[PDB]
Amino acid sequence: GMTEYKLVVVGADGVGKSALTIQLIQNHFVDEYDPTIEDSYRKQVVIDGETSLLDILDTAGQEEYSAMRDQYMRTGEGFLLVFAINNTKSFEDIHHYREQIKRVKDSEDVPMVLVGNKSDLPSRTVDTKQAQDLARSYGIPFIETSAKTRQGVDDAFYTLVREIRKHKEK
Template sequence: MTEYKLVVVGGGGVGKSALTIQLIQNHFVDEYDPTIEDSYRKQVIIDQETCLLDILDTAGQEEYSAMRDQYMRTGEGFLCVYAITSRSSFEEITAFREQILRVKDADAVPIMICGNKCDLESERQVSAAEGEELAKSFTVPFLETSAKTRVNVEEAFFQLVREIRRMKKDDSAGGKPAGKKKKCLIL
């Protein structure tokens, strides 16, 4: 059975834990308890393949940012989450992506962008079009999700697994490994 190491990243309070717990335990947690780091495992079937998701739910708070390099090194795919009700959390996505690429020393890494809390339409600060535009500029998939109403929760994680599979397939199809940067040596 294939195991996929997924990492959920994003600013504080965007709903990373709520999305993860909704996927794993099928319920919505509405009290806010900032995460330092939690790990979850779930066996699922994605496109007729049984696989094990190993999901690392990370801290959004800046005071835990020193831990990021470590989990970014071990993760295979990244769910980058912002809240549609928070413009600043949306603006943080670019920095998360840049850090992932730097730590992985790659031009491309399996990433899925999620605009969470889409059930809070009246408090929206980031349009769906802006989310789509950002994802398009990074050439990664995008979905709006709601951990509360379970909208696109499974789909977001499953789509990320498909991205990992696609990039692995591209790697094994010959040629240069997709994403790995060439080293420059000056003698």
């Protein structure tokens, strides 16, 4: 069989959510992608030998808190918390996005992976150990990625699928 996974990519504007998503869907780097458009994208892959359909919601748009948007976000089975390693403010915002996921999911156990993107850039301001400590505080995996080179991209999405699998087994 194939298993479908609804993944949601969240994080501050400009961190590479769309670039990561399009790397997964299309296997190359799209540097200027519709900064204002929120869409979902589907891709069949194979993860640990299991055919997997990834349905990826690339978030964007206005900050809105409503019953309708909560219920749409609630359909995510797992979430990528993305910041950029040259952008300390995006790192500081991670806690807010995690907070919102727990609320709409109404569970302390939501599959999540912390993603530090833009690892190809030399101007690093977020130390890998600091991001690891944040991930430890949440009990989730941390993966460094470059949507530009594709390093870490499959690991980030596939690790999230493995976290969802753990959750579904309960």
